[PDB]
């Protein structure tokens, strides 16, 4: 049942993600895969899923088992609009990833680097 929630998060089926959380699930619980619902959404550039998880009370700075923040996850995969929303919602851009680098130091994306300034 954890994988099907992960499948809805990655593909952005907001209706399924809405039911799972409405049934009493924790938007901050690390799934068996090793990431929190914010990670799977930001990893796939799901802007509409990030907005829902955020106003539902998810920790915008929580790391996964890879020590990757939801902001760093979107930066690694090059999701510009997701980096824009996370920064606007207060994501801490000073956190270093598992390589000791901030989001600004870990990407060559000029669009993403401009947002991180």
């Amino acid at each position: 049942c954890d994988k099907e929630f992960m499948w809805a998060l990655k593909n952005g089926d907001l209706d399924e993600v809405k039911d799972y959380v409405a049934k009493g699930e924790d938007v901050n619980r690390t799934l068996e895969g090793g990431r929190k619902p914010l990670h799977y959404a930001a990893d796939c550039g799901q802007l509409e899923i990030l907005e829902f998880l955020l106003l539902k009370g998810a920790d915008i700075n929580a790391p996964d088992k890879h020590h990757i923040t939801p902001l760093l996850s979107a930066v690694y995969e090059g999701h510009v609009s997701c980096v824009k929303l996370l920064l606007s919602k207060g994501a801490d851009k000073t956190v270093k990833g598992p390589d000791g680098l901030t989001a600004f130091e870990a990407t060559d994306n000029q669009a993403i680097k401009a947002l991180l300034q």
Binding site: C1, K3, E4, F5, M6, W7, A8, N11, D13, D15, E16, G33, G34, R35
Partner: protein, 239 residues
């Protein structure tokens, strides 16, 4: 019936790839003569069984009779059976534990199963990975990969010869307002042959996994082009 099996295989390559189970069953009811020859030649989706406590995948290389041996408990779920040698079974557990991480790092889920069997001058193994995208009415999909490796030792054992044959079955279905229902199904098969050194810092499993990883990365690249590029251009050519 050598030309009968030819038309039977030529029929499965042309039928909708999401109905292989019933087509092959209808195909065997039509001609029961080639019942055993077809099942050993037609690519079928991987079936899942429970150890009864992880899941494990069923195939012919881990089967003896009508029973299936689990790669975790090392016992057939229908109790009996053909067992691996104590030295090979030990190497098999390391293979399952190695490819269980490979499954998590590249698929973030699904089920994996590894089975080995001793030949004569070496051993051969099968790597089974199954990733299904259930739990959504709008987006579905599944990924089945079947790897068969043949290891051949060379004299002192510092270098060995590997022979890899992999098949990846890929299915996707979307139900959206604009594009309606879109269904993609099919497969792809590749063969490999290479020899690498076998030191203590790179055992057999480190060589087998290094060839399965590079192969699946190559197959994925070809699948992305024939699924979402080639068929797209054909659609736009129709209009």
């Amino acid at each position: 019936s050598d030309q009968q099996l030819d038309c039977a295989l030529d029929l499965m390559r042309r039928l909708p790839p999401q109905q292989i189970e019933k087509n092959l069953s209808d195909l065997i009811d039509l001609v029961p003569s080639l019942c055993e020859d077809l099942l050993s030649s037609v690519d079928q989706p991987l079936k899942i069984a429970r150890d009864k406590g992880k899941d494990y995948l069923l195939c012919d290389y881990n089967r003896d009779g009508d029973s299936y041996r689990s790669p975790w408990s090392n016992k057939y779920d229908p109790p009996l059976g053909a067992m691996p040698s104590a030295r090979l079974r030990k190497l098999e557990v390391e293979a399952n534990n190695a490819f269980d991480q490979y499954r998590d790092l590249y698929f973030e889920g699904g089920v994996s199963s590894v089975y080995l069997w001793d030949l004569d001058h070496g051993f051969a193994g099968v790597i089974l990975i199954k990733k299904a995208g259930d739990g959504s009415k709008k987006i579905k999909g599944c990924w089945d990969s079947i790897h068969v490796v043949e290891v051949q030792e060379k004299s002192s054992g510092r270098t060995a010869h590997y022979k890899l044959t992999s098949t990846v079955m890929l299915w996707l279905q979307t139900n959206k307002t604009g594009s309606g229902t879109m269904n993609l199904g099919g497969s792809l098969t590749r063969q490999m042959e290479k020899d690498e050194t076998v030191s203590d810092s790179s055992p057999h499993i480190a060589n087998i996994g290094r060839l399965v990883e590079d192969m699946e990365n190559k197959i994925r690249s070809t699948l992305n082009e024939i699924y979402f590029g080639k068929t797209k251009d054909i659609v736009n050519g129709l209009r």
